[PDB]
Structures are given as structure tokens and as C-alpha cells.
Amino acid sequence: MCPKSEDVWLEAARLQPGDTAKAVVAQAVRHLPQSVRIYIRAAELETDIRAKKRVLRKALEHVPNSVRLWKAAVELEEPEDARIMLSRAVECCPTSVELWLALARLETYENARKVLNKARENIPTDRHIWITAAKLEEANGNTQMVEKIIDRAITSLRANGVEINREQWIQDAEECDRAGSVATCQAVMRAVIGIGEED
Amino acid sequence: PRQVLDLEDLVFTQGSHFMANKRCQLPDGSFRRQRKGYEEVHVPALKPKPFGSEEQLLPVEKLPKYAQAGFEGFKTLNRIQSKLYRAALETDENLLLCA
């Protein structure tokens, strides 16, 4: 009665069994294609690796500008296939810092530097890409470039317009110290304490 | 000790088009190009293997009289026919020709 509705199709997929939910998702894709929620519900109701990979490939062929579909496609394949999918997701959606961070983390340092440069050229106001580049530099053989990278990131944030609020930097330092990046975490903590006498 | 298994899950869903390998080995000068709406992948004519010092196309004179009547009109043989001539005419074992 009410076609081309994502919430009604999601409720019909959640209320029906999976053998009926597959046909309901096929009818919803035939009535209203390029839906990220319907494709995610179809990939979630597949209970297989190849069926979910085919559903993710169909969602990428229908709507390639979906970050959730690319995140669902990259998390279910091989890590080399995950990097090959994250490269296409960064080439199709340059405004996704999480896909660029996943592409830089799942590759070599010579590719991670180019991925961080492309993320800085595409999104200069992003602060998580610079923290990911600092963590990748601290995880490599270099140890003194993290402070210069943090200084360059602070200069780029001061020149772009994102002021230091001293609340997300402490969380980024805690996430870096919880993941084995204590040098960049200490540098971010010193940069937050320097911009954040007795009081 | 016996367990009822799923006979339909272990079977191949594609059948004749079921590819057991994930990657495909391509030659050196076999690049592809997407011109307009379709991708053309070319593979050139591969060079044949060079014949050895003791490997050549055996003529009909090396075949015995029991096999000479079947090869009427053929002066010489092929490379795969001469490389396995003793395994198909002089040997009665089970042969597997992947040609």
C-alpha cells in the first residue's frame, strides 16, 4: 500500500522469516533501489559469506557512494581484499576519514603516507586522519617524526579554524595509549596541556 | 557413529561454472582496457615449447604394422602424439592426457 519506504520495508524484513525476508528485500530493491538500509538488512539476513559478498557487490554497483555499504563490504573479506575495497571507497567517497584510516592501517608505510596525504588534501579539517598518520609513524621504525607531525597537525588545525577544545585530544591520546602508541599519545597530551600558571 | 549431513550445502551452486580458484594467472603482455561501456581483455598467441634433442614428431615409419593401418594419409604425427607414443601403443596402463 505504501511503496518506496525504507522504514516499512525494514519493519517487514524484521517481522518476516528470512526465507520471506529475502524475497521482501528483493521486492523492496525492485521497487526502491539504491537503499543502504535495505541492502544492509539483506546482507544481514543472508547467513553466508558468499551471499553477503554478492549483496555488498550489488549494493556497491547500485549505490557506490554509501559509506555503510563499503564498511560492510570491507569487514567481511580478506585483509588484502579489504584494502582493495577501501582504496575504491576512498576513490569513490573522499569525505570518509574512517575508510581512509582503514586503508592506511591495512597497508605498508609507503602507501599509508600517500593515503594520509590524500586524506589531508581532501579533508584538511579532519583531525583523526592526522592522529592515524602519527600512530602509523610511531608504529614504524621512525620515532622522532611523530612530534613534528603533531606540530604540523596543530598548525593546520589553527590555520583551518578548528580550535583545540582539550576534550577530544585527551580521548585520542587515551585511544592511542590503549592501542600501543604511547609516544604520539604523550605528544598529544603535552599539546593539550600546553594549550589547556597555578590554576 | 553415523551422522546425517547436509547433502545440498556441500554441493556446488554454480555447477559447471563453479570456479575453485579465486585468482587467475595471466600472461605478461595480456593487459586489458575499458574503452566505452565494456572491458576488452586480450591474450596474445603464446609461443610453443621448443623441441628437445631427443624429442621430435615421429613419422608413420616408427609405428608398427598394427597401428599403421589406422593412420592412413598422415605422414608425420603431432607433438603430443609423439611425446606419448610409447604410452598409448606400447604400454597398456591407464593414461591421462591433459591436452
Binding site: 559478498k53 557487490r57 556497491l60 554497483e61 573479506e77 581484499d81 582493495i84 575495497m85 582504496s87 575504491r88 576513490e91 569513490c92 | 585468482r23 587467475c24 594467472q25 595471466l26 600472461p27 605478461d28 595480456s30 593487459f31 586489458r32 575499458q34 572491458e39 581483455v41
Partner: peptide
């Protein structure tokens, strides 16, 4: 050598 993959075929199409 033209190596075919799923991600390259998804990005090219």
C-alpha cells in the same frame, strides 16, 4: 599481467 579481482571489478563497473 591483468589480475582480475572482485574489488577492481566493482570499482571499474
Amino acid at each position: 599481467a591483468i589480475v582480475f579481482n572482485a574489488t577492481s571489478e566493482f570499482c571499474r563497473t
